Design an enzyme around this catalytic site. Structure first.
Site, PDB file in Angstrom:
ATOM      1  N   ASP B 518       0.832  -1.191   0.000  1.00 41.00           N
ATOM      2  CA  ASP B 518       0.000   0.000   0.000  1.00 41.00           C
ATOM      3  C   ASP B 518       0.871   1.248   0.000  1.00 41.00           C
ATOM      4  O   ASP B 518       2.097   1.182   0.125  1.00 41.00           O
ATOM      5  CB  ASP B 518      -0.942   0.007   1.208  1.00 41.00           C
ATOM      6  CG  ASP B 518      -0.200   0.112   2.523  1.00 41.00           C
ATOM      7  OD1 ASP B 518       0.689  -0.728   2.773  1.00 41.00           O
ATOM      8  OD2 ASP B 518      -0.507   1.035   3.308  1.00 41.00           O
ATOM      9  N   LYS B 587      -4.758  10.096  10.791  1.00 40.62           N
ATOM     10  CA  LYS B 587      -4.532   9.520   9.474  1.00 40.62           C
ATOM     11  C   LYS B 587      -5.771   9.633   8.608  1.00 40.62           C
ATOM     12  O   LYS B 587      -5.691  10.040   7.446  1.00 40.62           O
ATOM     13  CB  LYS B 587      -4.117   8.054   9.626  1.00 40.62           C
ATOM     14  CG  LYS B 587      -4.058   7.251   8.330  1.00 40.62           C
ATOM     15  CD  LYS B 587      -5.328   6.434   8.103  1.00 40.62           C
ATOM     16  CE  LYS B 587      -5.440   5.286   9.089  1.00 40.62           C
ATOM     17  NZ  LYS B 587      -6.664   4.473   8.853  1.00 40.62           N
ATOM     18  N   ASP B 762      -5.041   2.853  -4.501  1.00 41.79           N
ATOM     19  CA  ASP B 762      -3.600   2.978  -4.320  1.00 41.79           C
ATOM     20  C   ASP B 762      -2.935   1.685  -3.860  1.00 41.79           C
ATOM     21  O   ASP B 762      -1.856   1.354  -4.359  1.00 41.79           O
ATOM     22  CB  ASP B 762      -3.290   4.096  -3.323  1.00 41.79           C
ATOM     23  CG  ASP B 762      -4.053   3.949  -2.027  1.00 41.79           C
ATOM     24  OD1 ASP B 762      -3.778   2.990  -1.277  1.00 41.79           O
ATOM     25  OD2 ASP B 762      -4.926   4.798  -1.755  1.00 41.79           O
TER      26      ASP B 762
END
EC number: 2.7.7.6
Lengths: 329, 915
Positions: B518, B587, B762
């Site tokens: 990732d 995050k 992603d």
RNA sequence: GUAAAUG
DNA sequence: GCAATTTGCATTTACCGACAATATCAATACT
DNA sequence: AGTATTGATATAAGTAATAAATGCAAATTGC
């Protein structure tokens, strides 16, 4: 007599909440003369008056100054208007009560378990000589409050279980047009049929002479309303103001079934009865075509029908066995 | 039989290939059976039931459902044939003059071709299917969608024969055809019914219309319900045989059809669009033009490689989840078995309000648990049915470019358990690289990704007995796996490591787990390359470094310092929250910020990720907003070049939304001088995908139909654009388009190499063996994509596409510069006879360029001699600085912000690019 | 409309 | 030019107090 | 002229209105 609120006093106020009033003793006494309320009330001095949305209170002041009833009550919630009324009627026989007439819980609380007001009860033979109410619902925002107030007569759940009581009703002139229309006229609707069923009306006033074309010409000839200048309602932005005089009448039918049939027939108020009956239920069109005898009615428009024919339709609906439950809701 | 177990038991590559081919051939028929549409099966079943009843000769009301449907079909077919004959008599006439007819033929051409026999099946099936689908039971549905659903069903039905070889029907036509078909069904919908006559008190026998049209009032609005007979409701309730025409969407079993055109690709017997265009004709038109020209072939290749990954279901994890499922207790992820919604005690006003709050909370908990349990039901039934099968997923793009799976119930886009129940069908040699990478994968699954590679491997080595126990006793053991952050993925990978440790040589092991490569804030990693910001790149682990510098950790440190200062100054909430600032919530907020997230969405995210931490138990919003107000400030103060680039993009979006055409407005748009904006932000991705933002102002209009006038919003009609939405949507749309481009380029390169590449935006997945090759491919593709100036290319493409566009601006008339424009409008005023009109001004301006359009010499010279109002504004260098009276301004787009000095060849050597 | 999931 | 007013990245699933509202009627635009 | 089209008002009637409170103020368009 009581101190009538002056034009200078009403001028200082700012928050009318969208309610249009009048401030003309001449216009009010002309309206009273047209009404001729003393004819129905053999003994007026025992009248108990319960005024709803008094707002400015000038109409209530005129009423009391003219008739001097026994008990007089005013129901309001608006803060500024309540301040005005309380500040203007200290010590007067005017009973200033803070409640919001929009909620039936208010009536249910006021009737018996507090004994705020004691309405003398009468049967359905004669219009009540004791209880009376005058309502000013000119605020265009809350207009279906009138429809609720008017179906309350039929359900008999309101005070209208206490006999036959007049309720003089200051209404927005467009709402008066909607209520008071006759068959074949653009403004006839569920208001009009509920009016014809549960009461009778006499138009008593109107602001603008121009909209009188909307009303029925023969009705105007019969009524002769007390017309007044449109420069007499304090909020000039609002629409013209009309008055109606409703007196409940004896009726013989089932209120809920009548409501179902009329409400589901007036949606299609131009397509004639030869097609609109399908909306009532399955097979309603074919059955009512088979059963209805007056074949003129079969082509008469749903806006061309009257309360008697609607009662006939209700009777046939009841005679109908496949009748779906009216609590389909 | 277990196909996966058989394939695993086969060790030889040749027999493995033969097995794969044989299963492809065998599952072809199963896929066709699974995808068949119930437009013929229902008719054949009804005819069979009617024939059986006729042959038997005994009437049975309970079984008469299919016979009644057959009777309705028989009574309804000739009438639709009559309507088709009316159509073909109407349109085919040679004379095209309208003679005042009382007919509409807009829908006639719609249902002309075939809508004769398969239609009554759809109307009956759909109308019965929507028993109380729209909360219309008080039985029946809402006509508004009932007419459209029939039209939508016909839409798909028409495309069914086309794929067996008028792109999009207007919602008006859909509603019209639906309403005519439903009315026709209503005419002949007869059913036997019995009732008691109060005159006789005896049963009365006859017939009634099955579906009766009616109108219902809700809060002061006619709804137009379409009710159903109570006897029919009773009969349908007992049987419970829906037999819906359209089968649901399930993972494929055959290798999906590769994308070739914008319209064909994916399911073998279904139509799927390359874009998830909700409702817009312009997106469809530009995508069709792009497909015909052939400038997204690389996008086709990327989708092909992303979708050609075969999968299977993980048997051991399935058994464990099935055991805990049948236990049905309150567990970490699966909600559990709940019996009843307990009623809070009803008081006979503060107590009443507390009771109301408790009732609302309990009802909300009931709804949440029921929804979660139902999802889990569907997911687990699909997994149970799909054990030991090949699961090809055909993918699909939304309008921005991000790739999604076609099947929406069972996919790796789901939650943790859904991801865990999936493993790669293929197996490849693990080796030392695979061993190290799989240990790293478990280490980062446990949330310890912010630590270096060797430390991660050391952690995985350290918890060896913990892995052993958690795989030996899945329940009632130590249950160390549940301590992780990705429970079921951790369980699968632990299983595999426990088996490996039980094996003497790790090298010989054959792996199936997907290994997670990732990226941290792909949006930030794209701003870094777009702006050339060295500081951003060294902040987001783009430049090579011995240790990875985590962006979430950095911003968490900064907000921790900020709230420490707040605690010093005296905030009680800051003092409480001083020691409980979580990397997870910070995050999530930072990651969503680059996605153009709104304040409400971000505070909802912080509340969501704070409630399990239980810093505040129930009132999670009041603390979440207080956290947001500081967190956005921190993110903005750290990030500068990113903020500048997104501000440029938003300002350009505004100046494009407020634009005005030239040719279109030459014809009077009937609004006089007040204009109607009709231009949308449009550009091309590096791949070449036309990204047309769909935001517009759509208002509903009543459409006449036989039953009633349905009140629907027609997207096919031209509408104005929504400037607010387009401006707020441009930056994330561009960034997500870039992410999708990077995704698809990486997938194409991996497919060229010969890997198995499954990707969630992603994050990228591959076997532990080929992680190194995939990382090399990732870095090379990223640097190749961003080795050129994409923002400058975008600006010059805006200039090329929107060259002859005129903005609207209200400069002051008293300005001395107005003299030339005043003279031009005065001469126009004399010709017009009144005040100069913007339409006439636009016409004159277009005439100026019209002369220059013709290469003929006299056209150019006179065109050079022409003088227009806009030509006055062409002389000012800074029109924005110069800028009351409304006047025409040429379209001016600000120059790109200055670019930094950054080196993608330098970023290439960063091992921590994608961990 | 509400709730959950994913980046 | 001002001033108060409206609402916001992409997708997916399930659920219910509940969702795209419909019928005249007048004012005006079309062949 | 004369049909055709669009805009506005009512419909039920307990998912109320008024103005008093709040917001995320910032990006938006009201005028």
């Amino acid at each position: 007599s009581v101190p009538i609120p002056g034009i200078k006093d009403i001028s200082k106020l700012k928050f009318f909440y969208g309610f249009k009033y009048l401030w003309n003793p001449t216009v009010y006494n002309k309206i009273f003369d047209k009404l001729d309320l003393t004819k129905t009330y053999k003994h007026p001095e025992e009248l108990k008056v319960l005024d709803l949305y008094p707002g400015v209170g000038i109409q209530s002041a005129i009423f009391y100054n003219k008739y001097c009833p026994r008990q007089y009550s005013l129901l309001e919630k608006r803060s500024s208007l309540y301040k005005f009324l309380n500040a203007k009627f200290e010590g007067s026989p005017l009973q200033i009560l803070k409640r919001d007439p929009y909620d039936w819980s208010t009536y249910s609380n006021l009737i018996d378990e507090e004994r705020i007001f004691v309405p003398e009860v009468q049967s359905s033979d004669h219009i009540n000589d004791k209880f009376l109410t005058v309502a000013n619902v000119t605020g265009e925002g809350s207009e279906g409050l009138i429809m609720q107030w008017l179906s309350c007569i039929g359900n008999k759940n309101w005070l209208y279980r206490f006999g036959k009581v007049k309720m003089l009703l200051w209404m927005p002139s467009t709402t008066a047009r909607k209520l008071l229309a006759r068959p074949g006229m653009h403004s006839r609707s569920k208001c009009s049929v509920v009016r014809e069923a549960f009461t009778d009306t006499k138009l008593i006033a109107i602001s603008d002479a121009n909209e009188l074309k909307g009303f029925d010409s023969q009705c105007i000839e019969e009524w002769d309303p007390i017309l007044f200048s449109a420069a007499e309602i304090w909020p000039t932005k609002g629409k013209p103001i009309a008055l109606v005089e409703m007196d409940p009448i004896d009726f013989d039918f089932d209120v809920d079934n009548w409501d179902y049939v009329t409400r589901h027939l007036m949606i299609l108020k131009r397509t004639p009865l030869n097609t609109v009956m399908d909306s009532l239920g399955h097979g309603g069109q074919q059955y009512f075509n088979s059963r209805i005898t007056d074949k003129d009615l079969l082509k008469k428009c749903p806006i061309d029908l009257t309360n008697d024919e609607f009662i006939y339709l209700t009777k046939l609906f009841m005679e109908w066995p496949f009748k779906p439950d009216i609590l389909m809701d | 039989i277990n196909f996966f177990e058989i394939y695993n038991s086969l060790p030889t590559l040749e027999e493995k290939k033969a097995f794969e081919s044989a299963l492809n051939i065998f599952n072809q028929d199963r896929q066709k059976v699974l995808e068949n549409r119930a437009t013929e099966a229902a008719r054949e079943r009804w005819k069979h039931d009617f024939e059986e009843a006729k042959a038997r000769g005994d009437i049975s009301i309970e079984k008469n459902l299919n016979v009644k449907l057959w009777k309705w079909y028989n009574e309804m077919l000739p009438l639709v044939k009559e309507e088709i004959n009316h159509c073909r008599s109407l349109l085919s006439e040679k004379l095209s003059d309208k003679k005042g007819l009382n007919k509409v033929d807009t829908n006639r051409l719609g249902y002309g071709p075939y809508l004769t026999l398969i239609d009554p099946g759809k109307m009956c099936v759909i109308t019965i299917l929507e028993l109380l689908k729209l909360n219309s039971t008080g039985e029946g549905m809402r006509t508004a969608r009932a007419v459209i659903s029939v039209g939508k069903a016909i839409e798909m039905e028409f495309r069914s024969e086309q794929v067996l070889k008028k792109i999009l029907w207007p919602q008006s036509i859909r509603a019209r055809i639906g309403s005519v078909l439903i009315s026709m069904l209503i005419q002949v919908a007869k059913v036997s019914v019995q009732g008691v006559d109060p005159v006789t008190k005896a049963k009365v026998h006859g017939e009634a219309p099955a579906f009766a049209h009616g109108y219902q009032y809700h809060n002061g609005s006619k709804l137009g319900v379409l009710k159903i007979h109570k006897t029919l409701i009773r009969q349908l309730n007992g049987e419970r045989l829906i037999a819906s025409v359209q089968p649901q969407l399930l993972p494929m079993l055959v290798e999906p059809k590769p994308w070739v055109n914008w319209r064909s690709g994916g399911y073998h017997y279904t139509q799927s669009t390359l874009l998830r265009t909700k409702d817009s004709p312009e997106q469809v038109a530009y995508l069709k033009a792009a497909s015909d020209n052939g400038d997204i072939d690389r996008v086709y290749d990327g989708l092909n490689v992303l979708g050609r990954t075969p999968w299977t279901v993980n048997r051991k994890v399935f058994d464990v989840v099935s055991q805990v499922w049948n236990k049905g207790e309150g567990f970490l992820d699966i909600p559990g078995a709940q019996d009843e919604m307990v009623l809070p005690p009803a008081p006979p006003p503060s107590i009443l309000r507390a009771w109301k709050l408790q009732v609302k909370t309990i009802a909300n908990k009931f709804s949440s648990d029921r929804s979660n349990r139902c999802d889990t039901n569907y997911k687990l039934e699909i997994a149970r049915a799909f054990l030991g099968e090949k699961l090809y997923f055909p993918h699909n793009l939304d309008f921005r470019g991000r790739a999604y799976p076609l099947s929406p119930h069972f996919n790796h886009l789901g939650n943790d358990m859904s991801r865990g129940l999936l493993i790669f069908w293929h197996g490849k040699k693990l080796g030392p690289s695979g061993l190290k990478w799989l240990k790293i994968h478990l280490s980062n699954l446990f949330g310890f990704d912010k630590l270096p590679l060797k430390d991660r491997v050391a952690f995985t080595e350290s918890h060896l007995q913990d892995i052993k126990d958690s795989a030996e006793n899945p329940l009632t053991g130590d249950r160390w796996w549940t301590t992780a952050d990705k429970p079921w993925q951790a369980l699968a990978t632990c299983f595999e490591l426990n088996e490996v440790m039980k094996m003497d040589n790790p090298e010989e092991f054959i792996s199936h787990q997907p290994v997670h490569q990732d990226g941290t804030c792909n949006g930030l990693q794209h701003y870094a390359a777009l702006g050339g910001d060295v500081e951003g790149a060294t902040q987001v682990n783009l430049v090579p470094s011995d240790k990875p510098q985590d962006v979430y950790a950095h911003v968490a440190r900064l907000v921790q310092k900020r709230l420490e200062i707040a605690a010093e100054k005296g905030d009680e909430n800051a003092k409480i929250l001083k020691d409980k600032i979580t990397r997870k919530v910070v995050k999530q907020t930072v990651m969503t910020n680059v996605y153009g997230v709104t304040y409400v969405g971000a505070t909802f995210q912080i509340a969501k990720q704070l409630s399990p931490i239980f810093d505040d138990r129930k009132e999670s919003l009041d603390f979440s907003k207080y956290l947001t107000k500081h967190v956005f400030s921190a993110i903005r103060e750290l990030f500068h070049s990113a903020h500048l680039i997104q501000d440029w993009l938003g300002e350009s979006a505004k100046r494009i939304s407020k634009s005005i055409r030239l040719d279109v407005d030459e014809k009077s748009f009937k609004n006089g001088n007040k204009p109607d904006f009709m231009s949308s932000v449009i550009w091309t991705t590096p791949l070449g995908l036309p990204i047309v933002q769909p935001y517009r102002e759509e208002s509903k209009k009543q459409v006449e139909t036989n039953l009633q006038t349905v009140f629907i919003s027609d997207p096919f009609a031209v509408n104005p654009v929504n400037a607010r939405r387009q401006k707020a949507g441009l930056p994330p749309n561009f960034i997500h388009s870039l992410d999708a481009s990077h995704m698809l380029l990486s997938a194409a390169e991996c497919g060229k190499q010969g890997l198995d590449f499954a990707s969630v935006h992603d994050s990228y997945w591959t076997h532990a063996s080929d992680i190194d090759t995939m990382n090399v491919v990732l870095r090379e593709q990223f640097i190749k994509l961003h080795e050129v100036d994409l923002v400058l290319r975008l600006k010059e493409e805006f200039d090329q596409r929107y060259k002859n566009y005129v903005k609207i601006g209200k400069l002051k008339r008293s300005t001395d510069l107005a003299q030339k424009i005043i003279r031009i409008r005065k001469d126009l005023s004399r010709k017009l006879g009144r005040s100069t009109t913007l339409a006439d001004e636009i016409y004159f301006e277009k005439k100026r360029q019209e002369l220059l359009n013709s290469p003929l010499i006299e056209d150019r010279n006179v065109g050079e001699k022409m003088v227009t109002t806009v030509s006055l504004f062409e002389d000012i260098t800074d029109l924005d600085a110069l800028e009351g009276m409304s006047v025409l301004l040429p379209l001016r787009l600000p120059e790109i912000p200055p670019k930094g000095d950054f080196d993608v060849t330098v970023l290439r050597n960063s091992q921590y690019f994608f961990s």
